[PDB]
Design a protein around this ligand. Sequence first.
Ligand SMILES: [Cl-]
Length: 293
Amino acid sequence: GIGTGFPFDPHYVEVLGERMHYVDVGPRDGTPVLFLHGNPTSSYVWRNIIPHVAPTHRCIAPDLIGMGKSDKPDLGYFFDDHVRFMDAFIEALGLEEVVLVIHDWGSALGFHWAKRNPERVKGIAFMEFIRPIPTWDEWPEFARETFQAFRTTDVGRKLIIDQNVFIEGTLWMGVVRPLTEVEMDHYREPFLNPVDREPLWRFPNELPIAGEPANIVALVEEYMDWLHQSPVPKLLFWGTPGVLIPPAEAARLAKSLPNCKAVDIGPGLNLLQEDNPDLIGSEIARWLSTLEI
Ligand SMILES: [Cl-]
């Protein structure tokens, strides 16, 4: 079935006095493809997509600061912290122009960086991405009560940090097919020390839902305005029923984003990579061949 192994040699780079881990495969010459995961995942989420792209393009997949095999300093892990570390990661590797492949909070990082560096982004492939959720009615019903509890300090931290609910419960609820024990262990590994679960709690508290927190809402609105104006080639993957991007929203985006190709992956929730990695990787690989790179 879907591959469970992580057959990538570790690479580390110094970023702002810490070290970040990243996958780095594929040819050295050309435009690199930068894969950005979100919550509560790591570069592991790209393990079955990267092999479709690596034959033709360099694939760089960092673990966000505090996650995967990256260092876990004593930060709050605000979106601003992820921005600072990812900006510095890209510069530390000397990347010039890139293609972005982005998901969940990795998509907020990717779109925010693209808005600020438009001349350096030659294409964006994205899925289940951060957009403003104007009211809780747009969040899926079965998951509203949980995310509302996550978005508190005392109850939410007890759930996410003390009891590891984002890993043990939410993650499994983000894939239609059942994650296997080996896959769960790969997702659990970075967070075996409860103190290291800080980013898993801060992330849902940063989600731009019903206008709060206002700083995140504004930043996400700004990159969405940029995206609808930009001629950058776009590739949107979507599934049914989705979580962040239900089918009706995917359809709205497909007709209103310039130069946008849209691919229905079939059944999918949030981690679309875990329900249909082969279609995602194969379509990205072919789409890269149509770009001016
Ligand atoms: Cl989240």
